[PDB]
Amino acid sequence: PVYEHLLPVNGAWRQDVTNWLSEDVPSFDFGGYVVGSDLKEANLYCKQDGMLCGVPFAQEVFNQCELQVEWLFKEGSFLEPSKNDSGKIVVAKITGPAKNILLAERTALNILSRSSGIATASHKIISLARSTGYKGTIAGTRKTTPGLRRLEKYSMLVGGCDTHRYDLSSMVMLKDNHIWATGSITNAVKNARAVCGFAVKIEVECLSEDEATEAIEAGADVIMLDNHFLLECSGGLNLLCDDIDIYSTSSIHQGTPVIDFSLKLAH
Amino acid sequence: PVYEHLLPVNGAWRQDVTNWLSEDVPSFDFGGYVVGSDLKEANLYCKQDGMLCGVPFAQEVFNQCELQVEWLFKEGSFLEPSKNDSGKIVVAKITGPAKNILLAERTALNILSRSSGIATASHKIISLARSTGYKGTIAGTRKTTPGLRRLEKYSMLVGGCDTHRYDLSSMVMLKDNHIWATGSITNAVKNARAVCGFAVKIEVECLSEDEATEAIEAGADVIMLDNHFLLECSGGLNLLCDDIDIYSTSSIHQGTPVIDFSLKLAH
Amino acid sequence: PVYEHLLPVNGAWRQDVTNWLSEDVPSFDFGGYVVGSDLKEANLYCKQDGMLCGVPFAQEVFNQCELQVEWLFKEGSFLEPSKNDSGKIVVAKITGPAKNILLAERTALNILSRSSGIATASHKIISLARSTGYKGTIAGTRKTTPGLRRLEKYSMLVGGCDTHRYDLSSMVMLKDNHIWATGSITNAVKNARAVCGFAVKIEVECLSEDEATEAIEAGADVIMLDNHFLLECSGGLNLLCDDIDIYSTSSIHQGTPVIDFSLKLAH
Amino acid sequence: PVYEHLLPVNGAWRQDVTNWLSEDVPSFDFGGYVVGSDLKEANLYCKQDGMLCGVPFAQEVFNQCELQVEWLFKEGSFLEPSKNDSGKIVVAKITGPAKNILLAERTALNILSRSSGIATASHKIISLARSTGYKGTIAGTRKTTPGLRRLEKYSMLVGGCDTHRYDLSSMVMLKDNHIWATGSITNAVKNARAVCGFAVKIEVECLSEDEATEAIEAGADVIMLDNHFLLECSGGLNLLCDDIDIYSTSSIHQGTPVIDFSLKLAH
Amino acid sequence: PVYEHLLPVNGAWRQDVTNWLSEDVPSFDFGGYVVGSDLKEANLYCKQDGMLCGVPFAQEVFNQCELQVEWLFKEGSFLEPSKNDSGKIVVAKITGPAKNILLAERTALNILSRSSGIATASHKIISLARSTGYKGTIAGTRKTTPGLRRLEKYSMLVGGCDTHRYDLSSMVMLKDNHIWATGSITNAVKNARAVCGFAVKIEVECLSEDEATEAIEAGADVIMLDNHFLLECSGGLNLLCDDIDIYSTSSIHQGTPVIDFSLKLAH
Amino acid sequence: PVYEHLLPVNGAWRQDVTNWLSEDVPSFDFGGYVVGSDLKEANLYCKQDGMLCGVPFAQEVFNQCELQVEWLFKEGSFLEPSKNDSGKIVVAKITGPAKNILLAERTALNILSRSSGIATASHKIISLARSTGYKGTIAGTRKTTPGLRRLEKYSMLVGGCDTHRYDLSSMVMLKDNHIWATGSITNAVKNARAVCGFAVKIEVECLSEDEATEAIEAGADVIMLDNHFLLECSGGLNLLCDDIDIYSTSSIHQGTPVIDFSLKLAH
Ligand SMILES: O=P(O)(O)OC[C@H]1O[C@H](OP(=O)(O)OP(=O)(O)O)[C@H](O)[C@@H]1O
Numbered sequence A, B, C, D, E, F: 001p002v003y004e005h006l007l008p009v010n011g012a013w014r015q016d017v018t019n020w021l022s023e024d025v026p027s028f029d030f031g032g033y034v035v036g037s038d039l040k041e042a043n044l045y046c047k048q049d050g051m052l053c054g055v056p057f058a059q060e061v062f063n064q065c066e067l068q069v070e071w072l073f074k075e076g077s078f079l080e081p082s083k084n085d086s087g088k089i090v091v092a093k094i095t096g097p098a099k100n101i102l103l104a105e106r107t108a109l110n111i112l113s114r115s116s117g118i119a120t121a122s123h124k125i126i127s128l129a130r131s132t133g134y135k136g137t138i139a140g141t142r143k144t145t146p147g148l149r150r151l152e153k154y155s156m157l158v159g160g161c162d163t164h165r166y167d168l169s170s171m172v173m174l175k176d177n178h179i180w181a182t183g184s185i186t187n188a189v190k191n192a193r194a195v196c197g198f199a200v201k202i203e204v205e206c207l208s209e210d211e212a213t214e215a216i217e218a219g220a221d222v223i224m225l226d227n228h229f230l231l232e233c234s235g236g237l238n239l240l241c242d243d244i245d246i247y248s249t250s251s252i253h254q255g256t257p258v259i260d261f262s263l264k265l266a267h
């Protein structure tokens, strides 16, 4: 199994890459004009310790820029430019017209830095939860960067964490507002079930053992206790664990530090 | 002068908001079905100390969701839910069909959290540079989140920092690769000037007083010393200042923490 | 609960309507020129017995054409222009510039006819399965019309049938190809689980009680016997039932007859 | 002459295919992950008697999925998996990474089934009209599936039927509403002619020999009698013929049965 | 009859306007920031003698900029700021936030100038052909500005000229290449007819009375002699007329001078 | 340095070409059907004296049409089919399926004709200004054809002229409206500077030596006198020069004649 196989050979994500490029060049690329098209070589460097993530995305950036890339590491690999010999690590060798390389650069690096950042912070928490004996799941949230949801969720998976529900059409998530609207948890679940059906799970945010039970018996698939079936707890970060099912946290993705990368031509 | 006036009454950014919404609802919105359309009220809360940024963007999210919003604070205001009475601060009151509110929620909050995060980290560094007596500029970089460049740069401005060049068509940025390509700084500048013209500035990354001088005399508009005209230094973060012109740093935007926001219905 | 609440106040589906309109007018609308903009009245007729479906979609067609519509029946209602007095039934009254009405016409009718057709054929089979005592689900398939998936699935729901999985990112569906690839059902399920996680169900097409059992124990959520958990059988149409969980059929949607509608101006 | 030559080497239709794919994979393709990329072989089967239509479209689906296809039959060929040896007929052999094949599958089959269905029902009626001695035209209508007009009209042609006017910018179609608006048929035609010009035909729906004559003399190109030049009659289905010019019917396309296809990997 | 009724209330053309706006503001509108949103008044001036064309287009520019416009002249009117009192003529009064006005300006003026230019040059030639007694048609060509075809053809109509065929799907245009391909004019026409059908005209470029005759008898709708039915001659500009049917010229649209317009705020 | 290097290997401009093609073929290409796919040869001719411009654009048209092109002249070359031997000049040889050639034709020619027209008129004025001894710049304007800005500006550069500011986000352009809004030139400049920053120039339209001075001292980068820093004068065409900095004119691009091109197949 290879993570990049999650991405469809063709689909919207590739168009996203094209749009990211247009975002950087609205009219002309003056630098490309001065630099020209002589064939060049270049190395893509990792300058900080962390997991390598975002390969297929950066690869797509390089393909549309008509370059030849050779990846020295598999996506998911844990890089440690700990060696101060340089403090850097070549993760890919690139070849192509000078201008194409420089056009690609900033976009590919912006993808890798952030993708690697989410994967890394993801790995750290699942390695932490795992090191206590906990056998459950650590999930992310829907508090993703607008327009970048595909990439961030993907980065969560490579890091070893669950993604939780992708969107609002994905797994139903019921709360008080919904329960108050239908008059009861049981009613909220019945209506939710009537439209999502058997193929999609229903989750209910409960505030008491009585809340949960009613949900359980309405047929809810997941139960979130805050403040047959699975249980979830969510609210906080890298710090509560018990032999329960789900712990969600936006700390793995939202507002996380980045893993620094750089790209320089040979000579 | 009002920052939101930077955004064109109509243009691509509004389409970005629609796409951000579609990203959250690819097929149906089951929750909207259970909750229904009864008119509701809700408050948008700020749960952490920082500057409020992203108003026009979140406002656009609310407009497309056909809601009525009342903002209690001007964008740019420094919020301090320091008072533990609640640890929160209502920055806007919203009204509209229950489902519309819940559809809007996650997107608007994801905009505000990140926009406020960049503005805040931006304000902290310019307030810091300013507090030493430095009279120059603190700028950002092109290491922005793919697809979110408009919002992040905008957030930089509201925070009190320069944005630097928007893209590759914006201000010309010459380096060794370009200089090596044309044979000299003077040649790189001549070619750069020939295509960008008088309306757009040319910047050159120099590594010596001789490098700079030649650039100065080629006619470069900005000079970056690393490692008539303006001078720039860039590489590091919140820590070197001297009565010089430009200090760039991706720390104001890239991989920065977020300012937490929440939204809950009345009853 | 109102079905149309499944559609997000704003999102891609509304853009689909605009594209459907452009599809009918690539350059000019000569008829609109001759007819002009005088305000007119018109009735939307149902000419065949069946369930009314597609309201929010046709409504969106009418909104973009700047018209005023009054629906005489709730979506989901079973219409019977059985009365030969006319053999027709007015389901909506429309008002607006003559040209706008005529532009709207063909698109709205093409939506209603097909949407009503799927809903009707859907209602007939669930009413049939229900009339035998069967207490389970009748679902649809992914054999939908390219580009029209949102509308057809929506029509399935209004008719009283399940939609089954929306797409490939929705509920995992494993088969022999996958099982052969990983070496075993157990392995196929483990890999499927590793990437979809807890929020999304996994279904396995089994050909024996031993196939199923292994899937059950791998943790599959649904099992399809062809040729804790739920069971599914799929292959045929309006004709096998037993007190089991799921029966899927493309007969409810694919290649189904249409429910005839017409629209004429008053005088 | 080859029908597929009607499609421009590049244009919107290819983008439609990409959108149809995205429609099936909004976020990840879990199945593609489990199945992997090992090169595989597969056969595309026809399981029902009818005409093969939709080749260039399904071919485009296969090209974007980076596969190698070998078509065993020319588009337009009449297939008869009448032989119960299998009741199936291989119409194409495919090769490529397992996941790519499975991604392609449902979309290509949904194209073929419907395209073949329209072509078949089209061939049946023109073969029927032809078998009586009728030397005229059998046309379709604008009651096409929203967003799928290009494919359905194309399927009409391959089947041997006319498409009639593509859209509202295509051939002018005047009616009572228009005639009432301008005060007379003669006036409606004059205005229609003034904007469409010589390159585009004008058709008028007449209800009497006097209606027609005035249209004829206004210069209308086609006349529809319902209830130099050409005459048309339209309203009903597979059942009135006389040595006249045009008979239109939505029965050839709208709400027609589908021709079943399937695709399975080798081993 | 009003020309603007040719444009569909909604469709692609309105999106074109939005794209034209985005083209002018890729990131921020600094001027809008300095100018602010105070309500202002402004006049749209015509500075050269010619026909007013492009109203609905410029109106759409103004609507998306949320302004209030009052047109003092009907589209099609012949303006003569011949009076040197000012040499200008107010054709519309506008009101709205200062910034919105200034954003709109350049786009609306670029539409009007060119639209008015094509209409004017169109009127001049049809008034010229008409003044000799010629009772036929003066048409345009497909040599239109890429991406601006809708607007230019529309401008042709308002000027009093035919548009000729809109595109390649519009009226069939056969030539030697086609005739050589099928072996004969008769064959080229048969194949053309087989795919376009009765609703669309077929034109043939003939080089002899024998060429024409064969086309006539193949059933071609139009015949172009260069170098029942209609005849066409095309090649040259404002200068050959005889009581024949069609004279085409790109001089009415391609590379034509523009009609100068300006827009200034009140005080 | 090669001008075409200004265009990014991939970005929006290539999508513009696809849209230009779709604009010509909304449904089918009947001519392509009759002509077929036999491999053919063809020559692209220049029929009027002027500079060759638009190569990368026409090349992109040819690439998407899957053709093989051989350019006989470098973009920027001054062609003179002055020789009446033919009055034409082959600038490129093309090979590919007959239909693909004919599909490409009109679009590529419409690009070249206009691109060459702007370049030519651009070269004529800079050669004129240059021939007087003037050592400054001749610039264009923002009065470009809606949707075609990239191509026209690009054509300006190849011709030897400046493009001036690309858009409203490009170089700030202040006027009376802005100055009146902020109360003074000094204030308008301060606000403009506060949002555009150091990377983008600020220009001010001054009407007196006192106007200019205040702008100069506010820090404006350019000053336009109409009716350290650079000076500009703009208003008129091919006719005032003095040893000053900038002369802008829309005459180089807007409403300029076209350079005629043609394309014919070999035999
Ligand atoms: O961000 P974290 O603290 O990790 O918490 C993540 C949780 O937040 C969400 O609640 P919701 O979005 O409804 O309320 P919120 O916006 O106040 O977090 C949902 O409960 C997530 O699982």
Ligand SMILES: O=P(O)(O)OC[C@H]1O[C@H](OP(=O)(O)OP(=O)(O)O)[C@H](O)[C@@H]1O
Residues within 6 Å of the ligand: A261, A262, A263, B141, B143, B234, B235, B236, B237, B248, B249, B250, B251
């Ligand atoms: O991220 P920061 O450390 O604040 O530095 C920002 C600087 O980085 C950029 O260099 P470039 O992108 O060419 O090299 P890099 O990728 O190694 O930083 C450019 O020099 C920016 O001003």
Ligand SMILES: O=P(O)(O)OC[C@H]1O[C@H](OP(=O)(O)OP(=O)(O)O)[C@H](O)[C@@H]1O
Residues within 6 Å of the ligand: C141, C143, C234, C235, C236, C237, C248, C249, C250, C251, D261, D262, D263
């Ligand atoms: O169309 P129906 O006969 O109702 O059957 C529907 C079933 O078809 C599908 O199988 P798949 O698509 O893998 O094989 P197919 O194409 O041969 O039906 C899947 O099994 C559906 O549940």
Ligand SMILES: O=P(O)(O)OC[C@H]1O[C@H](OP(=O)(O)OP(=O)(O)O)[C@H](O)[C@@H]1O
Residues within 6 Å of the ligand: C261, C262, C263, D141, D143, D234, D235, D236, D237, D248, D249, D250, D251
């Ligand atoms: O669907 P069919 O019965 O084959 O008829 C097709 C005819 O329908 C159309 O009329 P129009 O769409 O104006 O009226 P309608 O919607 O009542 O058919 C037009 O007359 C078509 O040629």
Ligand SMILES: O=P(O)(O)OC[C@H]1O[C@H](OP(=O)(O)OP(=O)(O)O)[C@H](O)[C@@H]1O
Residues within 6 Å of the ligand: E141, E143, E234, E235, E236, E237, E248, E249, E250, E251, F261, F262, F263
């Ligand atoms: O531009 P004008 O001189 O008015 O001529 C217009 C004519 O040009 C076209 O021929 P085609 O485009 O096939 O050959 P061309 O490119 O050489 O004009 C077609 O014949 C037009 O009616």
Ligand SMILES: O=P(O)(O)OC[C@H]1O[C@H](OP(=O)(O)OP(=O)(O)O)[C@H](O)[C@@H]1O
Residues within 6 Å of the ligand: E261, E262, E263, F141, F143, F234, F235, F236, F237, F248, F249, F250, F251
């Ligand atoms: O078209 P030209 O005469 O060459 O002049 C070009 C000048 O026009 C513009 O003014 P603006 O657009 O503000 O006023 P206008 O529309 O009246 O020209 C700006 O001043 C340009 O540099």
